[PDB]
Amino acid sequence: GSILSTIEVASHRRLFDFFARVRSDENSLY
Amino acid sequence: DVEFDALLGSYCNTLSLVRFLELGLSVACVCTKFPELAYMNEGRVQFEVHQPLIARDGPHPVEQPVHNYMTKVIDRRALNAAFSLATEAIALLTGEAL
Amino acid sequence: EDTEADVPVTYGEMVLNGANLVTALVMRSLDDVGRHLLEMQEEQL
């Protein structure tokens, strides 16, 4: 009767920054 | 004595429904539908703007393409409309009594 | 230049892009946790 919950990995990446220079606002989440 | 009748020539129009779409202001605002809003604590609008570029000749001193991440904060507001009923009409709309 | 213009009617809508992945089960191999996710993803499409 055990309950299994999938682990959640939270991470954010900015792959395009490597392709090009960027100057994103600090508050906003890219 | 009194006798009533209704002319068919015209009709008085009690207050006329005005859609907001039909007006001029509708231009200035793209309006979408939150199925829910108030449940949100805070929210933002995220969008990108490149910076345009102009090619030049000569030994290239400087430039590189540029993005931007612009995010702006929603402002919650609300509209309130009062409405009232006495009990005189509630029975009618309700149904049978005990 | 003109009098009668055209105006859009239907409001714009929204779509859910991305969410926390949260599920459960009552113990059926151990991979069904995985398979049930794709299930619960296939819904939103």
From TrEMBL, chain B:
Q: Which residues form a coiled coil?
A: none
- Source superkingdom: Viruses
Q: What is this protein called?
A: Major capsid protein
Originating organism: Human herpesvirus 2 (HHV-2)
- The gene coding this protein: UL19
Q: Which residues of the full protein are shown?
A: 51 to 148 of 1374
